[PDB]
Amino acid sequence: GFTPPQLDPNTPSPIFAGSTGGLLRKAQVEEFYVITWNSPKEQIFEMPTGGAAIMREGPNLLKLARKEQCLALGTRLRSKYKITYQFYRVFPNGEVQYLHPKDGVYPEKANPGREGVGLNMRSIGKNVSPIEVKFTGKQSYDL
Amino acid sequence: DISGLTPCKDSKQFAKREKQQIKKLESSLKLYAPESAPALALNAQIEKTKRRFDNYGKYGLLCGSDGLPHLIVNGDQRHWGEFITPGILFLYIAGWIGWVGRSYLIAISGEKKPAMKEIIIDVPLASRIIFRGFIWPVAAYREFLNGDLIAKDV
């Protein structure tokens, strides 16, 4: 309750002559991970679907295929072009889930306001053997 | 005469192998003049073969029905030249290799970056050690008694 989602509007998309690494039927029945970024100038970048695109001066919008595509793109953006980015997840029903910072801050700065999960308060050798959790849903690492 | 094997000094098929190889090398000898380099080399190989067969005869090797020397490893005193004396001759050299290598690795172990001495072999150090493996059967025995051969876990 400190950072609200951004709710990407109908922004323009980058100039691109079209490729074959784009959105297949996965988008037509599942999510397709829109990404939004804001360019200082009309520059040219490698698309994660192969090929070169020309980002527009101002906000852009790309609906590529999946999470790793937009996050690889955004990492290349932030490192090479020094640009803030945020990407989403667009289910076919209509909902738009905000995902990349989920706090307004990238997931490297340990900013308070995030609860620690996937957290085993022990060294990695002190997990029990499988026989101790035989015939139980907990495999080895959830106690 | 053990293991059903006749000696090669009194074997028929062994002499037959000899005659067959000699006729094979002589068939390749009637194509050159008897004084040129090929014929001289063929005659040298012929004498090499004949002395080879006669030496395998005179050492008491055992030639089976196929007519080839079958080495005896069991430990028969007559056949220690087959395995046991060259086996000791091997193990002496092999332990030389191992012992000079081990004493070298222990020598460089007290270095700042020892791995560079395994790449860039310290030839003075090894050469001072290279003859220290001459006495490996006694130095290693003492290092085993003193406890310096095998390392301790800590």
């Binding site: - | 050492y59 090797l61 080495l71 220690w80 030249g81 860039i120 030839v123």
Partner: protein, 43 residues
């Protein structure tokens, strides 16, 4: 030169020197003492 000898002491150069010397040794032994299957001295 110190560095030339440092390179001659490197593992491949010293390995090929050592194995060329060794190979010449075994070669000349198998020419002077060819065709050897049994150790006949004190046999």
């Amino acid at each position: 030169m110190r560095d030339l000898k440092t390179y001659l002491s490197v593992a491949p150069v010293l390995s090929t020197l050592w194995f060329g010397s060794l190979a010449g040794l075994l070669i000349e032994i198998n020419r002077l003492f060819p065709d050897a299957l049994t150790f006949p001295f004190f046999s």
